[PDB]
Write a protein that binds this ligand. Structure first.
Ligand SMILES: Cc1cc2nc3c(=O)[nH]c(=O)nc-3n(C[C@H](O)[C@H](O)[C@H](O)COP(=O)(O)O)c2cc1C
Ligand SMILES: Cc1cc2nc3c(=O)[nH]c(=O)nc-3n(C[C@H](O)[C@H](O)[C@H](O)COP(=O)(O)O)c2cc1C
Ligand SMILES: Cc1ncc(COP(=O)(O)O)c(C=O)c1O
Ligand SMILES: Cc1ncc(COP(=O)(O)O)c(C=O)c1O
Ligand SMILES: Cc1ncc(COP(=O)(O)O)c(C=O)c1O
Ligand SMILES: Cc1ncc(COP(=O)(O)O)c(C=O)c1O
Lengths: 199, 199
């Protein structure tokens, strides 16, 4: 139908929820999958996909290994971008914001909700580091599977999460003749300013 | 089946071609769609999706408006990342490289291959700038549609392209227990060094 300004909610999260909901409703693969880009110390951007696990006015949350590249990069530069690749629905959602570490309480809560085998997996992988063979991973997995026996499988100290603040949220929706609809929500003192951007 | 080092081609492009081919073969939406991330002058990364239009040992090519945000950003920092979001196939391809402008000859060649209405659209949109209403776009479109009458519709001077060099190419493929396969191809003097990365 198109995207007209007069139909936009004041809070970008309202619009995001609808699009997310419809994405699940359309059974797209991993509707919560978002591309998170970070920057290293030399000005070089880096990307990898992560899963959005929670969101609210404070920002969007995802979990990762604290010794990974994305983590090292965020510690040197917290500015990150998030892009939800919903093009099968002719849609795109981009977020600009600052990443901050979640508290152990939050992390513990979420970690103990993941499939056991997944919790064990968390222990196995020294994310982003070069390993000489896949076998290293599989061996540790088995070793830990029984070591724990799963008394409850502990939260690794190198596992955490980040919350990305909402400073800017862009919505994109397909248009014919290459003339798409773009609306940029810009935080401006707890309030949002909306502008249509040329496609 | 999995991804073992012994099965990797020496040239990462060989592996990329197979995965791209299979992606089209699987009828994923826009198999050529890739997320391109750039960095602004403040260290802030930015993302938007663009279409890969050509690739070879020199790098990956895509077209865009030369006055856009991505273009301004590339002019200040040419380091870019490219991520092909093929997660419906439990796959991921990430490229690190430098973006460089294509020559007018190349651009002219590709531009005149796009649907007429698409060529006209190129003229209409001052990409990334704030516009007060969608009507601005539609009006110009009609005005230009007949202005040109389409004698051939000229190449706008503000339309171009970039080629991103292949300095690093990462392949990711789903694994159970969160233990995925990751291989990072690293340019090292016209040659490629391969390392498996912890997931
Ligand atoms: C659909 C999908 C979901 C993923 N979710 C996560 C996630 O939530 N956290 C994570 O650390 N890695 C996740 N990954 C793997 C990452 O893309 C990446 O390989 C890993 O975090 C290491 O990135 P880094 O080396 O840039 O730090 C996911 C991959 C796919 C394809
Ligand atoms: C599937 C798909 C393909 C796209 N391909 C391109 C492209 O090749 N070139 C382009 O300039 N914009 C393309 N866009 C629109 C961009 O994502 C973006 O909105 C536009 O280039 C402006 O980005 P910028 O403001 O960061 O410069 C595409 C969008 C989608 C969803
Ligand atoms: C390395 C890694 N960590 C975390 C996740 C997702 O978190 P969870 O296992 O709690 O669904 C993924 C999903 O693919 C992943 O690959
Ligand atoms: C699975 C895993 N990841 C990360 C680390 C430590 O991270 P780093 O060596 O980058 O300080 C460890 C240390 O034992 C680990 O076992
Ligand atoms: C603004 C813009 N430019 C270019 C393209 C793709 O190039 P082409 O029209 O030659 O297929 C797209 C595709 O969605 C686009 O949205
Ligand atoms: C469609 C379009 N894009 C871009 C520009 C110029 O770009 P900028 O104002 O950022 O120098 C023009 C100038 O006429 C234009 O017509």
């Amino acid at each position: 139908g198109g995207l007209r300004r007069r139909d936009l909610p004041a809070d970008p999260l309202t619009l995001f929820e609808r699009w997310l909901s419809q994405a699940c409703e359309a059974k797209l693969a991993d509707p919560t999958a978002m591309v998170v880009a970070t920057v290293d110390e030399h000005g070089q951007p880096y990307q990898r996909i992560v899963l959005l696990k929670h969101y609210d006015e404070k920002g969007m949350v995802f979990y990762t290994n604290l010794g990974s590249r994305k983590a090292h990069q965020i510690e040197n530069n917290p500015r990150v971008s998030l892009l939800f690749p919903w093009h099968t629905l002719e849609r795109q959602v981009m977020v600009i914001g600052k990443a901050e570490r979640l508290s152990t309480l939050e992390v513990m809560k979420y970690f103990h909700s993941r499939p056991r085998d997944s919790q064990i997996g968390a222990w196995v992988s020294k994310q982003s580091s070069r390993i000489s063979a896949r076998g290293i991973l599989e061996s540790k997995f088995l070793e830990l599977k029984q070591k724990f026996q799963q008394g409850e499988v502990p939260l690794p100290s190198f596992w955490g999460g980040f919350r990305v603040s909402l400073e800017q949220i862009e919505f994109w929706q397909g248009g014919e003749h290459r003339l798409h609809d773009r609306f940029l929500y810009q935080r401006e003192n707890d309030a949002w300013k909306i502008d249509r951007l040329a496609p």
